[PDB]
Amino acid sequence: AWDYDNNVIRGVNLGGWFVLEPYMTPSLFEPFQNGNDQSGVPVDEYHWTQTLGKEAALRILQKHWSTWITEQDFKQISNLGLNFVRIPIGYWAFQLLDNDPYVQGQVQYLEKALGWARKNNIRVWIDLHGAPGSQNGFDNSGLRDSYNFQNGDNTQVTLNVLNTIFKKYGGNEYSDVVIGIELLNEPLGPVLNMDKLKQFFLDGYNSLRQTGSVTPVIIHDAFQVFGYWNNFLTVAEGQWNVVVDHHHYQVFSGGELSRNINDHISVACNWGWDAKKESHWNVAGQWSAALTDCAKWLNGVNRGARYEGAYDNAPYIGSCQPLLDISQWSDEHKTDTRRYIEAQLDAFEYTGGWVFWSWKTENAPEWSFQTLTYNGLFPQPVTDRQFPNQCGFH
Ligand SMILES: OC[C@H]1O[C@@H](O)[C@H](O)[C@@H](O)[C@@H]1O
Ligand SMILES: OC[C@H]1O[C@@H](O)[C@H](O)[C@@H](O)[C@@H]1O
């Protein structure tokens, strides 16, 4: 349903939909603030559902699921010249651990989305974004500050969930829509046992193929250096239809944030050069326009921004308040943003293409494809260049 050799993915993530992220939908979390005190705000979906209880969580999430993304969004995505969406979903949509606070019902909307994709000629990855125990301790895994994916029976439970996804979505029923199943989003390589992670990836690969599925298997790079995965899941070993997903940002450390715009561009261009050298098909599955970490709660609930020297012992670079509203951005910041977007687009189209994080946010413009497009900062058509050939690819 896709030609990974000849076609380029031009896509958006449907983030914040089936896995809550505080920075993307702060309205769901802000009612728990006590004036300026954020100490009682649940930090992740696990604690949000636990605090509300099952009845309230289901009422509020049903409303969210039914309105956040609809068929109209898919029409607009097609109209903007995009050809692809990535759909994050948590393990809890399929299976609950014994005392899990999570509520279910996401699957109904996932299946509506697959139909909306079909109708609008949009292809899809399904992405397992959160595993039991957490694979990364990020709030976007569902469970912040825990790293227990490789503990106990959590890896086994994850493989059981994947087998459900494989039987439902990796077969003939959706072979015209689903062009990849991503085994696990952003496993935090540095804190994991990498040998066990590779075994997990291999078990998932083999399990899918054993169902008779020919669906591409997408592996996230686990924050390893470019080329790390070249010798894994290879044609030499009869392993085929494998894609590596690289994520790229320049905002989650003081060193990255302090780069001037030219150096930000040089780094983006180098992402392209280095991805080209790899031996698997590869796609930039998450990236954005952000040049700051100013979005409220981007680093987590009750954590500040490195950009204004309010987190992670970073030096003050500038004040975030002026940057929260795209109408208040300086001409220079708008120009820097457009340059940065174009350099990333060129870099990522140099291999398998790109998937912007994310389609929409409530009020975080750096992270919203819609907002950037409407304000003329994301090229429309997406091939438009105000700053052509910044990287010099050949
Ligand atoms: O090397 C690029 C690609 O070649 C294809 O033949 C394989 O099936 C893929 O798994 C691989 O990513
Ligand atoms: O570890 C700090 C940050 O790392 C980034 O790579 C992730 O995208 C963020 O979610 C996380 O907050």
Give how far the C-alpha of residue 65 lies from the chain's centroid of Cα atoms, to the nearest Å: 18
Nearest to 306 by CA among 361, 258, 368: 258
Two tokens, residue 388: 């052509």
Resolution expressed in Å: 1.8
CATH node for 1-394? 3.20.20.80
Tell me the CA–centroid distance for residue 242 and ligand 1, in Å.
6
Q: Tell me, what amino acid is at 212?
A: G
Catalytically annotated residues:
186, 296
Q: Residue 14 in contact with residue 359, Cβ under 8 Å?
A: yes
Interatomic CA distance for residues 166 and 223, integer angstroms: 25
What is the rounded distance in angstroms from the CA atom of residue 160 to the CA atom of residue 172? 20
Mutating to test ligand 2, I would choose from 134, 138, 249 the residue with most ligand atoms within 8 A of its C-beta, which is 138
Q: Is the CB of 141 under 6 A from ligand 2?
A: no
The H-or-E segment that residue 75 falls in is helix 71-79
Q: How was this structure determined?
A: X-ray
What are phi and psi for residue 20, nearest 5 degrees? -70, 135
What's the CA gap between 187 and 129, in Å, rounded? 10
- Phi and psi angles of residue 126, each rounded to the nearest 5 degrees, phi first: -95, 130
What is the C-alpha end-to-end distance of the chain, expressed in Å? 28
CA 181 to CA 77: how far, in whole Å?
A: 21
b/e 58-88 (16+ beta carbons within 10 angstroms → b): eebbeebbeebbeeebbeebbebebbbbbbb
CA dihedral 185, 186, 188, 189 (to 10 degrees): 100
Cβ–ligand 2 contact at 138 (below 6 Å)? yes
Sign of the C-alpha dihedral computed for residues 19, 22, 23 and 29 taken in this order: positive
CA of 77 to the centre of ligand 1 (A): 28
Say which amino acid occupies 92. W
Q: Please name which ligand lies nearest the alpha carbon of 251.
A: 2
The reply to whether ligand 1 has any atom less than 6 angstroms from the CB of 282 is no
Q: Distance, CA 339 to ligand 2 centroid (Å)?
A: 23
Burial 372-385 (b: 16+ CB within 10 A, else e): bbeeebbbeebeee
Tokens (6 digits) for 332: 């220079």
Rounded-to-10 torsion of CA 351, 372, 336, 7:
10
Helix (H) or strand (E) holding 89: strand 84-90
Contacts 24+ apart (CB under 8 A), 204-207: 204/159, 204/162, 205/233, 205/239, 205/242, 207/159, 207/162, 207/163, 207/166
- Within the chain, what is the greatest distance between any pair of CA atoms? 60
